[PDB]
Amino acid sequence: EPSDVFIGLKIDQITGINQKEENFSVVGSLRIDWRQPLLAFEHAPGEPKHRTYTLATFLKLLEEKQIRWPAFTYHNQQGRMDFQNRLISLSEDGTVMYLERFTSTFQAPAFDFRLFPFDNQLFFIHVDSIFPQHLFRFQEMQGFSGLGDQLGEEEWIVTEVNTHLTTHNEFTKGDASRFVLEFHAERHLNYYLMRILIPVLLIITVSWFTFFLQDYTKRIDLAGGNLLLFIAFNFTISSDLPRLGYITLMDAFLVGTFIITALVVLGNVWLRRLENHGKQALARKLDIYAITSYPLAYLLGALTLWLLFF
Amino acid sequence: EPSDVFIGLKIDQITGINQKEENFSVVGSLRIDWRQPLLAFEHAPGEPKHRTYTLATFLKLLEEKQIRWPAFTYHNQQGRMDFQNRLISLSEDGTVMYLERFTSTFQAPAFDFRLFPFDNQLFFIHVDSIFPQHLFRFQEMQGFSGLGDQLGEEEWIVTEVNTHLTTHNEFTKGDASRFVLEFHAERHLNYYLMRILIPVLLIITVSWFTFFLQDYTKRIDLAGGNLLLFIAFNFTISSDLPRLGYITLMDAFLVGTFIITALVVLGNVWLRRLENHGKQALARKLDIYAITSYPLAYLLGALTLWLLFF
Amino acid sequence: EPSDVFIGLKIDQITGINQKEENFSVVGSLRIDWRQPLLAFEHAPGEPKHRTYTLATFLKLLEEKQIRWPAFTYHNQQGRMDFQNRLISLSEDGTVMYLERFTSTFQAPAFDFRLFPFDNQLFFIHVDSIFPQHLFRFQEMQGFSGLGDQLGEEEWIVTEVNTHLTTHNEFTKGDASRFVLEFHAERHLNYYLMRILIPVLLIITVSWFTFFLQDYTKRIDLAGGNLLLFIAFNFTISSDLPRLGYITLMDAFLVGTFIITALVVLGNVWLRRLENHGKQALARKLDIYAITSYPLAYLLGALTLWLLFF
Amino acid sequence: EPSDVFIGLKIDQITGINQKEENFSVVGSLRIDWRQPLLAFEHAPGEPKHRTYTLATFLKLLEEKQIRWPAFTYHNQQGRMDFQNRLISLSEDGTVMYLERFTSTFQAPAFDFRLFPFDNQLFFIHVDSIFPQHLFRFQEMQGFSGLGDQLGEEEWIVTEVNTHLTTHNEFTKGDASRFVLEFHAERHLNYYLMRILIPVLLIITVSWFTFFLQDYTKRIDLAGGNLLLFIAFNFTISSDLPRLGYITLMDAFLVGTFIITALVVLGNVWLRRLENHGKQALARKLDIYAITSYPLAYLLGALTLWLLFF
Amino acid sequence: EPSDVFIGLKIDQITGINQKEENFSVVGSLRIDWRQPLLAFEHAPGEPKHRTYTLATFLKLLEEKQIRWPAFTYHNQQGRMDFQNRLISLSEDGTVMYLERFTSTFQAPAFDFRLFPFDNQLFFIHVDSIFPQHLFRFQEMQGFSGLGDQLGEEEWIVTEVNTHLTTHNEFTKGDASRFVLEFHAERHLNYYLMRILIPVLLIITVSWFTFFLQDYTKRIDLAGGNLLLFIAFNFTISSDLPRLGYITLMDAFLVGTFIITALVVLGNVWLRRLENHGKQALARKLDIYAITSYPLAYLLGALTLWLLFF
Ligand SMILES: CCCCCCCCCCCCO[C@@H]1O[C@H](CO)[C@@H](O[C@H]2O[C@H](CO)[C@@H](O)[C@H](O)[C@H]2O)[C@H](O)[C@H]1O
Ligand SMILES: CCCCCCCCCCCCO[C@@H]1O[C@H](CO)[C@@H](O[C@H]2O[C@H](CO)[C@@H](O)[C@H](O)[C@H]2O)[C@H](O)[C@H]1O
Ligand SMILES: CCCCCCCCCCCCO[C@@H]1O[C@H](CO)[C@@H](O[C@H]2O[C@H](CO)[C@@H](O)[C@H](O)[C@H]2O)[C@H](O)[C@H]1O
């Protein structure tokens, strides 16, 4: 009969969420309870009823007794797992308690930035049993798994935390146990309001206000400058994401700013040649519509982006 | 009866304080005195009264004698702890002296940047007993714990250092000991006066002085440039912080600069159209108030920020 | 007779493709099946028919029995291979199953950026037998090798995956086995359309539209600014590549932008001196051709680049 | 009687001096000669008169014989010491020769940037005896300690190298030996002349030359631009230092550039309003003093900075 | 009699050349053949004629037999050497074959940037015998040492590869063997033509062409902008080098650009005041020489730089 391996994973810190590399790093602890009756002992007269081991001594003991351990792997770990404690407690009836405290980075392949920065992302850690389920069957350790009270993450807010058990077939024909700890996180938007939204809005609006001069050349100069600045914003914002194969909401907004600025310049050149070839009064009359249409474009385009993505 | 484990933590260096990642790194040393009578020995004729061990040999000896060690964990450590010395001295009556010298990064989850750069932050290191308090009870080693004389930190100044003992329930139903070494630090403000405050003040004041030209178009051009520069300052300053979900005092000051610059531009456009449609004398009379109100806004807004945050 | 070593390499993650350093990093797993009859055992009465080892214990056992293992090396690995599991399963007839799970960076010396960003690159991992082929002959493990379902790579798309066996002579006069896992990848072009192509097109076209002012000095000013911006784009784009000894398609396009902008400026200076020394009407007539030739240059040059590289 | 431990530290490379983190990294080698008569042996017939050990085997031998080793610590090491060789040679009379070759970073808490870039800094490595001086007394190994011939450091020049012995009380009530290797270094100034001094001088002087136009508005525009550029220089230069709590000479020079530029702008606005309200001839007469006082300010301020700091 | 240690070093990859840190990183392999007759064995009946060891087991065997190994050190290694394989093959007559495959960074203290980017640099790896030459004498392993076919380096081209044997006295009074593998490399210049040379040439020439306007103020404005851009190029280019104590050819060229631009501005101010105080015709006549002398300065200065450095 397969042996039961109870698994608990506890995330104590989120040291970082790297959206460009699409990974996240955590400090967490793994707890395993596994009753192996072959490990049963009897303490000596007035002798310890629980035996404490390093991971190394325990594995050497298991090899000497020819006992297979429930070997596992963090399936989506990437890089070096920095271990703090790898401790074993062995009770008299053969129950092995294992504590593994670590820091490690994990892949986040469910990142979808289409709604960025209004996106809710899925983060998980997979713990895979290497041996098949007719040898070991992972269970859920009760009252341990989850997320901690001081995760130390400022941009992200955890919205849902979940655990469950599934299967994998990485190395065996038969099914092998997989423990999953997953959580969902959304962003705090204050950073994007302050550093991205409000600057762009101020530039656009300050341009509109300066449009009341009635000097078409000034409009063209200012609009060219605004386009340059918007392209600087494009490069800055794109730096923080991966080189995605699809368009983000932020990309749509920035392309809108590019296009609206260019159309502003074009309309101003038409007005300036209208005033150049004698049509100054027609130029001013149409300047009325230029003013009364600069912000209609931005409102309408914002509604269009909302309709598309949401 | 529970065994007493005396704990001392000494911080010798602050190698860095990373406010963006909200962590800090230290070079420090841990001292543990723990009397285990089972470890008592007798030296041979004219033989050493104290035995020196590596951590590895000592733990193998403890496992061979089936003695549980007071296993501990740096609860808020993140990443790899680089150990320098892990030494053991065992006296004849069984007193274990342990020296652990290390470099490690630690989480700083109490960072609150609301008053930045006038903030005083709390930094701590937690040392957790893995086993419950009916087995081991942490005490305070006397005359060892604290902070050193050459911390090597230039921006921060330590204001208070403290130690105490509390409990945790990370891995056991029963309470387990927790040793805390905490200190409070504030910033030196010279960097912010020289690189942030004085440049912004110079830009604002040089703009005001140039406002005495009486050429409204020059005001608009200069103000647009000033707004661009202030947004560059926004991006630079925000780069050094995390993507906070709340507004910092620095954010409030930068938003004030944005808004005041935009209002300057708007007032200048109104003046320029007043001079455009025949009201040159009214334009100049109101230019008087424009000048006499440019700095009132900045003083009043600075007082408003002080009132809000302090 | 040489011993057969069956090899399987599975790539589970592409943690990154570094085109500047010309390397790529993966999380993957290596599987080796190797029948060594000298390792045959018999389980005790009702005793395990498969023995589980750490890599270290197994190698010590092999050394004690004076059995040569099929030593191998990742020929194009660079840096530190971070191992997760190094596990051994030994069956009763002497079949060794080895599992090696790792993270490592690998050289990508086949990077050819001539068509960048329309390039398809070759990535491979070489696994080399250190000992010659009269001792060990690598075979292909069936149903294991390849690439996974969640590679986590956003810019690149895998187009072909392949495995095969070849030889090398790194350390022996005789041939030694080499296992190769290779795959081809191309880029998603969305990043380059949004962040590179469309901004450059907008700048060029907005310049052309502003050319309808009929103010030659404005043309010269705007063109100088455009040249400056294009050189900023040159530096940015080149930052992401290595310091290649040959010209990339992107380099050709940027040099074209430089030259076309300079020719624009030159033509405008000629027009401005034509209008300066009395030939205003001739200046305007030729301005017709200036306008009707600004975009012909860009279309013709784009066709020329396509002809050259493709 | 305390045992003599002769110490030699040799610095072979300076891999880097990090003035922002206030540390420096070296490749060096440590030599220890320590006569322990308990380690005396006799070679077998025609057998080696010197025994070669790894550090690990030697420490296991010492533990088996219950011999305390002279445990030491690099007191100002920070981070991971990457060891190359840790070798032991044991002669027949019990003299242990130890070779430790390493790479490591070390704290530089004596950095004082007040005169930067004309500063001479103190760099040291402390080697601390953990055990008190009634057990071990550090001596100086003769003809080994110092700095090498190829340090590989380009910006810094070593001016003085010194060794000596002192005491510490880190872990014991009694005094413990401390070996110090210190050296003083100054900078090559060519980098600062070429990249900092000459650009600033060129900007200032080119501004002065352009002041001979007699167009006050051009002066104001150019001066505003110069102030912006000087603030860019401020941010760049400050990036390379820590966030110091005191003013550097470079900070004083940059603040001088800010202030002189602002005063230039102010004087030009006064001249422009003098010419505006009818006083063109008075404006020109005072423009004479404006010109004849622009460089007096810079010379006088440079002398003032020299007087203050030197 | 001293024992012969045959040495072969093979460089398979150049993972990077870091000219700012003046180091280079390689993936390479070390081969050592060393006949120690004390290691001679006899295989059992039908038993392996060659014994395979890990480095650790072999060193423990050597210590047990009290055999001194030829201990060596990579003299100019800096940082951590990441080992891939450390394998031993021991033949029946006692010949030890050692394979060491590694990744490591090495100091490049022969970097001389005076002719940069037309410089040919010397790169070497030193392998030092720790023990003196009356114990071990390094020889050259034949047919192994050198550089590989896929070095993976794009900017540099290897021009000469060499090996030889010399001596050192690092740790012993007597001479100890030193094996040297050195190679010379030069740069591909395409990067510097495309990203540095051609942009600067375009800026200079586009300025000259715009000089045919005959509007001195435009010349001054454009020249000031060009000086600013050249100083940006100075900072960018200097970022990639160390903070050298001497002047590079690139530094000379950039200082030339600064000075020529400033002289352009000065001449234009003189022309503008000549036209201001009534001498418009003299101003134009001398403008002829201004034009006919702008490029003479650049050609003459380029010849001067060539004469100085070459
Ligand atoms: C006065 C009381 C004294 C009694 C004993 C005190 C505490 C006992 C010490 C237990 C620590 C185990 O000792 C050592 O710890 C570190 C991390 O902590 C482990 O970790 C080390 O190797 C593992 C290998 O994966 C790495 O993850 C890790 O980066 C590295 O530092 C070591 O492999 C272990 O050998
Ligand atoms: C002439 C006198 C000679 C007498 C002996 C001299 C000194 C004795 C040497 C004691 C050092 C112990 O030897 C070695 O030291 C380093 C750090 O120092 C330890 O540290 C190493 O493993 C631990 C694992 O967590 C890591 O933290 C560390 O990054 C790594 O370098 C080694 O695990 C230890 O095996
Ligand atoms: C309740 C059940 C408990 C039963 C036992 C549970 C699991 C058994 C633990 C097996 C892990 C092996 O133990 C340890 O693991 C880490 C990685 O995982 C290895 O890895 C360590 O050394 C290798 C050396 O190349 C490095 O690649 C790696 O960076 C480092 O962390 C250690 O060398 C190994 O000693």
Ligand SMILES: CCCCCCCCCCCCO[C@@H]1O[C@H](CO)[C@@H](O[C@H]2O[C@H](CO)[C@@H](O)[C@H](O)[C@H]2O)[C@H](O)[C@H]1O
């Ligand atoms: C044909 C002749 C062959 C004869 C033998 C040849 C040479 C003998 C090899 C001696 C090297 C010792 O073997 C190994 O070396 C590396 C560095 O070199 C050491 O270093 C390793 O652990 C220490 C721990 O602090 C770290 O500093 C280091 O980053 C890590 O790589 C290993 O701990 C040691 O086990």
Ligand SMILES: CCCCCCCCCCCCO[C@@H]1O[C@H](CO)[C@@H](O[C@H]2O[C@H](CO)[C@@H](O)[C@H](O)[C@H]2O)[C@H](O)[C@H]1O
């Ligand atoms: C089915 C066949 C199975 C038969 C056996 C298969 C192969 C045998 C495995 C040999 C590898 C040796 O095992 C392990 O490898 C890694 C690198 O590879 C070594 O390297 C490790 O320690 C050294 C110390 O300097 C470091 O350089 C290195 O960064 C670290 O990963 C380990 O010290 C060694 O213990």
